[PDB]
């Protein structure tokens, strides 16, 4: 035999969760968030095809990675810009353009190619220290 039960249906409906980001590290926190963005927070079919769930950071202007850890953070991209390989750090993302640290740190924890970039869309970064996403009923949750 090879008959099998499932539990994908129950736990996937594109529900909405918020997760704090105000004064938070958003590094060690983000890891636990990524789990839930892929669909996994209870028994779920999730290493393979399934739509994710919405999980939203509430802030983006109080992201401090704390101590020396901050300064020597790594980020990369390889674009069609004449410099190719651009490399940046959390420290200089904090010194203007503070939105980008939270984006590339949660994209990185969801890649699968096509399906990976779908799950990414369900993230909204914001920066007011509040959500206007109360229209979709969010609630605080972590793994």
């Amino acid at each position: 035999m090879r008959t099998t039960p499932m539990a994908n249906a129950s736990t996937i409906e594109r529900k909405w969760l918020v997760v704090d980001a105000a004064g938070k590290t958003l590094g060690r926190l983000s890891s636990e968030v990524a789990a839930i963005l892929r669909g996994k927070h209870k028994p779920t079919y999730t290493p393979h095809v399934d739509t994710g769930d919405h999980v939203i950071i509430i802030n983006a202007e109080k992201i401090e990675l704390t101590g020396k850890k901050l300064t020597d953070k790594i980020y990369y991209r390889h674009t069609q810009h004449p410099g190719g390989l651009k490399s940046r750090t959390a420290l200089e993302m904090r010194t203007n353009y503070p939105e980008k640290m939270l984006e590339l740190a949660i994209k990185g924890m969801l890649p699968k190619g096509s399906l990976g970039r779908q799950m990414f869309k369900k993230l909204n970064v914001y920066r007011g220290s509040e959500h206007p996403h109360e229209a979709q009923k969010p609630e605080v949750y972590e793994l």
Partner: protein
């Protein structure tokens, strides 16, 4: 009654009215097999957690033997010229529960 039983090396969830695809057994047609290896009860019952419970005993009505359709397996070895093929099909049984006796 809720139950889970052993089907050799694997387990299957089983209630008091459902068919289930199981491994091959000699039995077919209208025969009767029992699964007193019922090793979890839990849906309206409570178990924790010696192997087997005596508060339940799933009973099955053997309902025909069917087969899993043939599926060609093959290994080619290029420039070594081996081409050994095999096919798995084989008989299997299906049984229908309809009563989990206490």
């Amino acid at each position: 009654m809720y139950a889970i039983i052993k089907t050799g090396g694997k387990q299957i969830k089983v209630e008091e009215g459902q068919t289930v695809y199981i491994e091959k057994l000699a039995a077919e047609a209208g025969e009767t097999v029992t699964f007193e290896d019922v090793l979890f009860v839990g849906g309206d019952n409570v178990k924790v957690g010696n192997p087997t419970v005596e508060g339940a005993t799933v009973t099955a009505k053997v309902e025909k033997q069917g087969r899993a359709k043939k599926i060609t397996v093959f290994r080619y070895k290029p420039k070594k010229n081996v081409h050994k093929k095999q096919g798995h099909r084989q008989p299997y049984t299906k049984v229908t529960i309809e009563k989990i006796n206490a």
